A and B are shown apart, each in its own frame.
Chain A
Amino acid sequence: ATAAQAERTLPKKYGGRFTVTLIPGDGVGKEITDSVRTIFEAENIPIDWETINIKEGVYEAVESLKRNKIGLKGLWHTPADQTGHGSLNVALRKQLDIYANVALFKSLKGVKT
Chain B
Amino acid sequence: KQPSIGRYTGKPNPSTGKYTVSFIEGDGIGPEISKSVKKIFSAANVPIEWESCDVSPIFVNGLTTIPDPAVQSITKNLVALKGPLATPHRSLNLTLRKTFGLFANVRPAKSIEGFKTTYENVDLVLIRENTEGEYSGIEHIVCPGVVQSIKLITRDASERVIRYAFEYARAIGRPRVIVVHKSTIQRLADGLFVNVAKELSKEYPDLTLETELIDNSVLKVVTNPSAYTDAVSVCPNLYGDILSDLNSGLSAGSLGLTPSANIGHKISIFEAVHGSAPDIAGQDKANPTALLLSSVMMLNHMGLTNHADQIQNAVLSTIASGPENRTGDLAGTATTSSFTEAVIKRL
Point out residues on A near B: beta carbons under 8 Å. 1-5
Contacts and interface: CB of A to CB of B under 8 A. Distances in A.
A34 to B, nearest CB: 43
B141 to A, nearest CB: 13
A5 B144 CA distance: 9
B143 interface: yes
Contacts of A4: 144
Interface of B: 143-146
Ranked nearest first, the 5 interchain pairs of A and B with the lowest CB-CB distance are A4-B144, A3-B144, A3-B145, A1-B146, A5-B144
Contacts, number: 10
Nearest to A6: B144
Interface of A is mostly: loop
Contacts of B144: 1, 3-5
A1 B144 CA distance: 7
A2 B143 CA distance: 9
A3 B146 CA distance: 11
Contacts of B143: 1, 5
Contacts of A3: 144-145
Given A1-B145, A2-B145, 8 more contacts: A1-B143, A1-B144, A1-B146, A3-B144, A3-B145, A4-B144, A5-B143, A5-B144
B91 to A, nearest CB: 32
Contacts of A1: 143-146
A86 B143 CA distance: 49
A7 to B, nearest CB: 12
10 contacts: A1-B143, A1-B144, A1-B145, A1-B146, A2-B145, A3-B144, A3-B145, A4-B144, A5-B143, A5-B144
A3 B143 CA distance: 11
A5 B146 CA distance: 13
A4 B143 CA distance: 10
Contacts of B145: 1-3
Contacts of A2: 145
B147 to A, nearest CB: 12
